[PDB]
Design an enzyme around this catalytic site. Structure first.
Site, PDB file in Angstrom:
ATOM      1  CE  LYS A   1      -4.064  -2.181   2.152  1.00  0.00           C
ATOM      2  NZ  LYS A   1      -3.516  -3.514   2.349  1.00  0.00           N
TER       3      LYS A   1
ATOM      4  CG  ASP B   1     -12.081  10.242  33.029  1.00  0.00           C
ATOM      5  OD1 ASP B   1     -13.252  10.587  32.935  1.00  0.00           O
ATOM      6  OD2 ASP B   1     -11.431   9.434  32.023  1.00  0.00           O
TER       7      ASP B   1
HETATM    8  O1  DUP Z   1      -7.469   2.328  26.503  1.00  0.00           O
HETATM    9  C1  DUP Z   1      -6.936   2.704  27.345  1.00  0.00           C
HETATM   10  C2  DUP Z   1      -7.295   4.221  27.522  1.00  0.00           C
HETATM   11  C3  DUP Z   1      -6.723   4.674  28.511  1.00  0.00           C
HETATM   12  N1  DUP Z   1      -5.793   4.299  29.313  1.00  0.00           N
HETATM   13  C4  DUP Z   1      -5.104   5.103  30.363  1.00  0.00           C
HETATM   14  C5  DUP Z   1      -3.825   5.897  29.547  1.00  0.00           C
HETATM   15  C6  DUP Z   1      -4.201   7.135  29.267  1.00  0.00           C
HETATM   16  O2  DUP Z   1      -3.136   8.158  29.268  1.00  0.00           O
HETATM   17  C7  DUP Z   1      -5.213   7.309  30.662  1.00  0.00           C
HETATM   18  C8  DUP Z   1      -6.103   8.464  30.641  1.00  0.00           C
HETATM   19  O3  DUP Z   1      -6.992   8.328  29.636  1.00  0.00           O
HETATM   20  P1  DUP Z   1      -7.511   9.245  28.604  1.00  0.00           P
HETATM   21  O4  DUP Z   1      -8.534   8.783  27.757  1.00  0.00           O
HETATM   22  O5  DUP Z   1      -7.800  10.708  29.330  1.00  0.00           O
HETATM   23  N2  DUP Z   1      -6.360   9.775  27.349  1.00  0.00           N
HETATM   24  P2  DUP Z   1      -5.211  10.720  27.528  1.00  0.00           P
HETATM   25  O6  DUP Z   1      -5.169  11.440  28.764  1.00  0.00           O
HETATM   26  O7  DUP Z   1      -3.669  10.120  27.324  1.00  0.00           O
HETATM   27  O8  DUP Z   1      -5.400  11.647  26.281  1.00  0.00           O
HETATM   28  P3  DUP Z   1      -6.525  12.705  26.156  1.00  0.00           P
HETATM   29  O9  DUP Z   1      -5.881  14.254  26.211  1.00  0.00           O
HETATM   30  O10 DUP Z   1      -7.289  12.251  24.848  1.00  0.00           O
HETATM   31  O11 DUP Z   1      -7.348  12.630  27.429  1.00  0.00           O
HETATM   32  O12 DUP Z   1      -5.824   5.901  30.835  1.00  0.00           O
HETATM   33  C9  DUP Z   1      -5.391   2.991  29.282  1.00  0.00           C
HETATM   34  O13 DUP Z   1      -4.576   2.508  29.922  1.00  0.00           O
HETATM   35  N3  DUP Z   1      -5.977   2.419  28.301  1.00  0.00           N
END
Ligand code: DUP
Ligand code: MG
Ligand code: NA
Length: 326
Positions: A63, A241
């Site tokens: 690809k 969260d």
């Molecule tokens: O599938 C997942 C999703 C999240 N996590 C952990 C890592 C992630 O950094 C943390 C926080 O989840 P978020 O959905 O808030 N992702 P992040 O903070 O890294 O990016 P964003 O800016 O989108 O919130 O939970 C996992 O281990 N597995």
DNA sequence: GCCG
DNA sequence: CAGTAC
DNA sequence: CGGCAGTACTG
């Protein structure tokens, strides 16, 4: 610093299509390939040059070659027209591929269709209400204000409580999809039954506006996923969260909640090769698994007072949060 | 999709 | 349990 | 052939 935009941008479209259609493993391979390309120092130019990079195989190399020679990618032209609509639907918080495909099959095509005719879970109605806001990233300055709002309410009734913002915030990103607040207590006991008090202090503030996931009945609640808004003019609703953990699990909880997700998965995968197991609770050793990789014996929890200990026990050099995007 |  | 999410 | 991370809510 991506030197392969011409390739990845096309592959990302394909990846998201597989993802939204429920082909989760095929989408996973695409994600790994796409990122691997993002990290390659130079523009890949040969079919053999493609294969040399971990995460890229014959089919993906073909690809890449097609894009390099043609400038287009044939598969992109035969992507189902359901896909933009499936993507529209599964960007509702609480609706995934199964719900989106069901809605599509029921003839729905627009969020107006969803609003007026679809059956919505309580989560999904909240997701739809905030459809735009949940797709926005906030500047990290606002994430700081939100962390401080939570930390103030928590330390108001126990000054011993430790609160840290994790996720993208702790990895140093300029913008954040949400705020992830980890809470613990350095005496290993007083962390117990405080969602009760914390969530109520934040409700009396008017700070929390909606709850998505919050099992407040049983007393062993580990997480709160909800919606907050800072006071005053010009404020958007933001995703929040919160997790509360025993002090013994702090390092592992920190590591997990800081991410990235793909980083966690890579680390967990590595532990598994070593007969170990890593989760948000603990790093374990002597884990007994069957032939399908499924845990059948629990093993021993290893002492892990800091994140550095987790890396050490795994035979890995420590990596700062900013270095954990992949 | 990739890889052991 | 399946679906969804962190 | 078959795993691809390991968890926590919801209903
Ligand atoms: O599938 C997942 C999703 C999240 N996590 C952990 C890592 C992630 O950094 C943390 C926080 O989840 P978020 O959905 O808030 N992702 P992040 O903070 O890294 O990016 P964003 O800016 O989108 O919130 O939970 C996992 O281990 N597995
Ligand atoms: Mg986050
Ligand atoms: Na969704």
């Amino acid at each position: 610093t991506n030197h392969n935009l011409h390739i990845t941008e096309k592959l990302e479209v394909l990846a998201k299509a597989y993802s939204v259609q429920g082909d989760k493993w095929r989408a996973l391979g695409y994600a790994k390939a796409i990122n691997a390309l993002k990290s390659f120092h130079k523009p890949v130019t040969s079919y053999q040059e493609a294969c040399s990079i971990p995460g890229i195989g014959k089919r993906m190399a073909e690809k890449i070659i097609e894009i390099l020679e043609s400038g287009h990618l044939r598969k992109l032209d035969h992507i189902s027209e359901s896909v933009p609509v499936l993507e529209l639907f599964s960007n509702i918080w609480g609706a995934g591929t199964k719900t989106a495909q069901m809605w599509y099959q029921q003839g729905f095509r627009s969020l107006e269709d969803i609003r007026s005719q679809a059956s919505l879970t309580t989560q999904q109605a909240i997701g739809l209400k905030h459809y735009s806001d949940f797709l926005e990233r906030m500047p990290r300055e606002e994430a700081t204000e939100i962390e401080q709002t939570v930390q103030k309410a928590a330390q108001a009734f126990n000054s011993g409580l430790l609160c840290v913002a994790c996720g993208s915030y702790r990895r140093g990103k300029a913008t954040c999809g949400d705020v992830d607040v980890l809470i613990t207590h350095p005496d290993g006991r007083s962390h117990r039954g405080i969602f009760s008090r914390l969530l109520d202090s934040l409700r009396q503030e008017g700070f929390l506006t909606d709850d998505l996931v919050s099992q407040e009945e049983n007393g062993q609640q580990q997480k709160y996923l909800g919606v907050c808004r800072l006071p005053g003019p010009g404020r958007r609703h933001r995703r929040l969260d919160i997790i509360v953990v025993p002090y013994s699990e702090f390092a592992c909880a920190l590591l997990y909640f800081t991410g990235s997700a793909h980083f966690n998965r890579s680390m967990r995968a590595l532990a598994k090769t070593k007969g170990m197991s890593l989760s948000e609770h603990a790093l374990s050793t002597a884990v007994v698994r069957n032939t399908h990789g499924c845990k059948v014996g629990p093993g021993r929890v290893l002492p892990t007072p800091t994140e550095k200990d987790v890396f050490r026990l795994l035979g890995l050099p420590y990596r700062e949060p900013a270095e954990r995007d992949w």
